[PDB]
């Protein structure tokens, strides 16, 4: 497996800079009410109140939040990436995994060259800089991309893995929380390797349990989780009911309609389906089911109808004001 991990550089921020060449240096916070490096350098983050940041650097612009454009910009780059992979797994709106093993019959050097091309190309078409990582599995491809996220191009070759793994810290591993990492560094686990010194229960107690199996696997480079030709970006359509009720002959037609539209706005069989029932309070009540298979419009109606019944066996007195569906994990191609 020769996985290539693509990751757009401070996307929202870099997109703006592209339309607004002005700020081709100027510390730009990308705000969302109801941020690029130059401003990020001044302690700026993502997840901490807008107040502070543009206070902690009021000189920093707080440009609007135009997600529909970041989306059309990300849909275009992703299609530009599909052509270059035996298969692609769109992670988020600006992160993808490509398995190109065969587009290059297992030749690692030829993957690094491909990556150098893909990096190029996205530049001549969207003029965006991306940071990729070429490695044996997905976890190494990502971890190495980050070690040089600033328009980088990491490369972990098959034979330099067990080495790399040795000198790999805990604070550089995906899925581990910074809060959980701080706990592990207190108990003396600095490198991924030190994980092996502890014995599982001592570890599960701390990390999740799922992260324990994860870390351990990673530690020994077992963790060879495949790239799945599928998009993890969800899509949902919800309808308002005539008036709030608990009928079914009335709700169901209005759920199948939500299903048909969520289905028209997606590009392939969904593997998960979720019946979202907004009720009389204003307040959510959900329950969906994931199929490895792939689903289809057919069972969509059938299965939806079941999750709906259950939700109706979950809150009573409470009628229903709007039914929806949230399709996810769209098997593509």
Catalytic residue among 38, 89, 95, 126: 95
Distance CA 251, CA 322 (A): 9
Q: Assess whether 6 and 99 both reside in one domain.
A: yes
The number of folded domains in the chain is 4
Distance CA 73, CA 85 (A): 19
Pairing of strands 153-155, 132-135: parallel
Q: Assess whether 27 and 60 both reside in one domain.
A: yes
Looking up tokens 């581990």 gives 176
Q: Smallest Cα–Cα separation from 308: which of 234, 258, 270?
A: 258
Q: Are 108 and 238 in contact (CB under 8 A)?
A: no
Q: Are 155 and 136 in contact (CB under 8 A)?
A: no
Q: Assess whether 120 and 87 both reside in one domain.
A: yes
Looking up tokens 């048909």 gives 260
Q: Assess whether 294 and 169 both reside in one domain.
A: no
Distance CA 225, CA 13 (A): 31
Distance CA 150, CA 156 (A): 17
Helix (H/G/I), strand (E/B), else coil: 239? strand
Radius of gyration of the chain measured on its C-alpha atoms: 23
Q: Assess whether 6 and 123 both reside in one domain.
A: yes
Task: Identify whether 310 is a catalytic site residue.
Answer: no
Q: Assess whether 122 and 212 both reside in one domain.
A: no
171 is in an annotated binding site: no
Q: Smallest Cα–Cα separation from 87: which of 97, 95, 77, 78?
A: 97
**CB within 8 A of 300, min separation 6: which ones?**
259, 263, 270, 273
Q: Which residues on neighbouring strands pair with residue 169, listed in sequence order?
A: 191
247 is in an annotated binding site: no
Distance CA 222, CA 168 (A): 15
Distance CA 138, CA 224 (A): 8
Q: Is residue 227 part of a domain?
A: no
For Cα atoms 172, 100, 176, give the angle at the middle one, nearest 5 degrees. Answer: 20
Which ranges in the chain belong to alpha helices (H)? 11-19, 37-40, 50-53, 67-82, 108-126, 138-146, 161-166, 178-184, 200-204, 210-219, 253-264, 297-311
Pairing of strands 230-231, 320-331: antiparallel
Domain of 211?
Answer: 156-222
Sign of the alpha-carbon torsion through 198, 201, 206, 211: positive
Q: Assess whether 268 and 257 both reside in one domain.
A: yes
Distance CA 231, CA 234 (A): 8
Q: Are 144 and 165 in contact (CB under 8 A)?
A: no
Helices (H), strands (E): how many in the chain? 12, 10
Distances 89 to 3, 53, 332 between C-alpha atoms, Å:
11, 34, 9
Distance CA 49, CA 52 (A): 6
Q: Assess whether 54 and 71 both reside in one domain.
A: no
Q: Give the length of the chain.
A: 333
Distance CA 12, CA 39 (A): 13
Q: Which residues on neighbouring strands pair with residue 214, listed in sequence order?
A: none
Q: Is residue 295 part of a domain?
A: yes
Distance CA 40, CA 111 (A): 32
Q: Assess whether 6 and 149 both reside in one domain.
A: yes
Q: Assess whether 135 and 239 both reside in one domain.
A: no
Residue 15, Cβ density class (10 Å: 0-12 exposed, 13-18 middle, ≥19 buried): buried
Q: Assess whether 118 and 180 both reside in one domain.
A: no
Q: Smallest Cα–Cα separation from 91: which of 8, 153, 149, 161?
A: 8
Experimental method used, please?
Answer: X-ray
């Amino acid at each position: 497996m020769i996985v290539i991990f693509v990751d757009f550089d401070y996307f929202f921020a870099q997109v703006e800079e592209v339309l607004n060449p002005q700020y081709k240096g100027k510390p730009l916070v990308v705000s969302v009410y109801s941020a690029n490096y130059e401003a990020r350098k001044l302690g700026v983050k993502a997840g901490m109140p807008i107040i502070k940041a543009m206070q902690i650097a009021p000189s920093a612009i707080y440009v609007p939040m135009r997600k529909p454009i970041y989306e059309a910009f990300s849909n275009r780059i992703m299609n530009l990436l599909n052509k270059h992979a035996d298969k692609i797994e769109v992670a988020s709106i600006d992160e993808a995994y490509l398995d190109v093993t065969n587009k290059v019959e297992g030749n690692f050097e030829n993957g690094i060259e491909l990556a150098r091309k893909i990096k190029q190309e996205i530049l001549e078409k969207e003029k965006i800089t991306v940071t990729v990582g070429v490695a044996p599995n997905k976890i190494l491809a990502k971890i190495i991309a980050d070690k040089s996220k600033p328009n980088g191009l990491g490369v972990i070759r098959p034979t330099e893995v067990q080495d790399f793994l040795n000198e790999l810290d805990i604070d550089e591993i995906p899925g581990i929380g910074s809060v959980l990492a701080r706990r592990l560094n207190e108990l003396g686990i600095q490198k991924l390797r030190d994980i092996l010194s502890k014995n599982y229960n001592e570890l599960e107690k701390i990390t999740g349990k799922a992260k324990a199996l994860y870390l351990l696997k990673l530690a020994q480079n077992k963790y060879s989780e495949p790239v799945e030709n599928k998009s993890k970006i969800p899509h949902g359509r919800y309808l308002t009911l005539p008036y709030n009720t608990r009928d079914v002959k009335v709700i169901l037609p209005y759920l199948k309609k939500a299903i048909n539209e969520a289905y028209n706005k997606v590009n392939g069989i969904p593997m998960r389906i979720t019946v979202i029932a907004i009720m009389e309070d204003l307040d959510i009540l959900s329950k969906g089911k994931k199929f490895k298979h792939g689903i289809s419009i057919d069972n969509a109606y059938k299965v939806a109808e079941d999750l709906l019944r259950e939700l109706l066996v979950r809150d009573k007195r409470r009628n229903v004001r709007r039914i929806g569906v949230k399709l996810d994990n769209i098997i593509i191609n």
